[PDB]
From a paper:
Angiogenin, also referred to as RNase 5, is a small 123-amino-acid protein and a member of the bovine pancreatic ribo­nuclease A (RNase A) superfamily. Although it has been assigned various regulatory roles, its core catalytic function is that of an RNA endonuclease. Angiogenin from humans shares a high degree of sequence similarity with the eponymous member of the superfamily, and the catalytic triad consisting of a lysine (Lys40) and two histidines (His13 and His114) is conserved between the two enzymes. However, angiogenin features a unique C-terminal 310-helix and its B2 site is occluded by Gln117, which is locked in place through a hydrogen bond to Thr44.
Numbering used by the authors:
A (entry chain B), B (entry chain A): 1 to 123
The structure:
RNA sequence: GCCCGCCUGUCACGCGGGC
RNA sequence: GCCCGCCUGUCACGCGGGC
């Protein structure tokens, strides 16, 4: 229900209809979601509807990926924001890599509680 | 220089790489370009690159068509979105007619400032 | 009340693929 | 037709939240 970790997932990994997908979009949203104290190293946001993402946690749109992870059946518009400069202290300058691929998540009680953020270091 | 009418021309009439050419695309882009309040009667979008469209104002890709208007030499992929109910008030339902034909524009300072939208009343 | 989100029903459209 | 997928709208209830 009101699983705080699910809602923490959305704060850090969900933006339904992004208003941009450049570095500015990252630097704005990475601050709006509180990830700029200290600068979070890298963070990916998923776009689209929420039901598609929750459905990953069940058979409709999900498959077993690893020890405690699940891979989505369909691909998602996503944006990955990576910190550059080498300074953990804000200003938290970012560079954006938008993409389109399947996402990996951990699930608890049919809910995404974490994003496998590792697959997005690679692009 | 003052390029503001060209800037409105692109916002109202240009989508380089449309994401569909069906009713969904129309209703999506008519909302995305803010044209839905009230519902614009009809509005046509041009696809392709900008230079082809600017060239209608020079002899490279244009000829005098009628009064202060010019017809393109080449044809364009275009999509015309027409309103469905007739009520200018939302919801703004649109039906799409994709086409491939010459476009007519008025030109100032080598730039399209208006589209002759009448030719698209004819499907 | 206005807005956003969740969830359900009901009107209903639109596109693509496989068989 | 059937399956899979994408993408949306109207209206009505219910729940959470902002004003």
């Amino acid at each position: 229900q009101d699983n705080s970790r699910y809602t923490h997932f959305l704060t850090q990994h969900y933006d339904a209809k992004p208003q941009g997908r450049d570095d500015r979009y990252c630097e704005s949203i990475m601050r709006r979601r509180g990830l700029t104290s200290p600068c979070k190293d890298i963070n990916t946001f998923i776009h689209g509807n929420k039901r598609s993402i929750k459905a990953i946690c069940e058979n409709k749109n999900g498959n077993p990926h690893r020890e405690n992870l699940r891979i989505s059946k369909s691909s998602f518009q996503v944006t990955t924001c990576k910190l550059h400069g080498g300074s953990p202290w804000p200003p938290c300058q970012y560079r954006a890599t938008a993409g389109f691929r399947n996402v990996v998540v951990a699930c608890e009680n049919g809910l995404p509680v974490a994003l496998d953020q590792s697959i997005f270091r690679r692009p």
